[PDB]
Amino acid sequence: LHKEPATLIKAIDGDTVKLMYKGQPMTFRLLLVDTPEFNEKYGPEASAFTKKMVENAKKIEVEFDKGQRTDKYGRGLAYIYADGKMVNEALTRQGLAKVAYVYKGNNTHEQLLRKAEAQAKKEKLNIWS
């Protein structure tokens, strides 16, 4: 797995972000996580968490897994990194996201995220309170 560059176009919600990638606008859906929708509980907190994380980043990178790069809705599927810190993992650690939509082929960082979730649960953080 390798990181490629990309620029914020726009925050969208907890687990989606508009990025410019290879000079094209594209909606990215975070691999292996599920944030609440904005209208659900901790949804706005999730949205704000991701928003602030990508918005304050000097360097946004995109990392595809070995499997599918696009979903059935045309959204990019990637791990997203904000100055070297993975958004997917950071949401999970803070209990603003659950591990989810784990498909074999696109699962390189599963254990790492389950590790993060386990620690969020332990602290009964946000969603787990």
Ligand X SMILES: Cc1cn([C@H]2C[C@H](OP(=O)(O)O)[C@@H](COP(=O)(O)O)O2)c(=O)[nH]c1=O
Active-site positions?
29, 37, 75
Q: Does 101 bind ligand X (CB under 6 A)?
A: yes
Task: Kindly tell me which of 46 and 77 has the beta carbon lying closer to ligand X.
Answer: 77
The amino acid occupying position 103 is: Y
Which residue stretch of 18-26, 39-47, 80-88, 100-108 sits at the interface with ligand X (rule: CB under 6 A)? 100-108
Shortest distance, CB of residue 29 to ligand X, whole angstroms?
A: 5
Contact between 98 and ligand X per CB under 6 A: no
Contact range with ligand X by CB under 6 A, out of 27-35, 42-50, 51-59, 87-95:
27-35
Q: What letter does residue 126 receive in the DSSP assignment?
A: G
Six token digits for residue 113: 């995220």
Q: Give the integer Cα–Cα distance in Å for 22 and 26.
A: 10
Structure tokens at 5: 């560059």
Token pair of 127 as six digits: 């969603």
Instruction: Out of 6, 19, 31, 62, point to the residue binding ligand X (CB under 6 A).
Output: 31
C-beta separation of 6 from 61 below 8 A = yes
Closest CA to 89 of 59, 65, 119, 51: 119
Sketch the per residue contact string, 65 through 94, with ligand X: x for CB under 6 A, - otherwise. Answer: ------xx----x-----------------
State how far the Cα of 43 lies from the Cα of 55, in Å rounded to an integer. 18
Q: Which residues bind ligand X (CB under 6 A)?
A: 29, 31, 34, 71-72, 77, 101, 103, 106
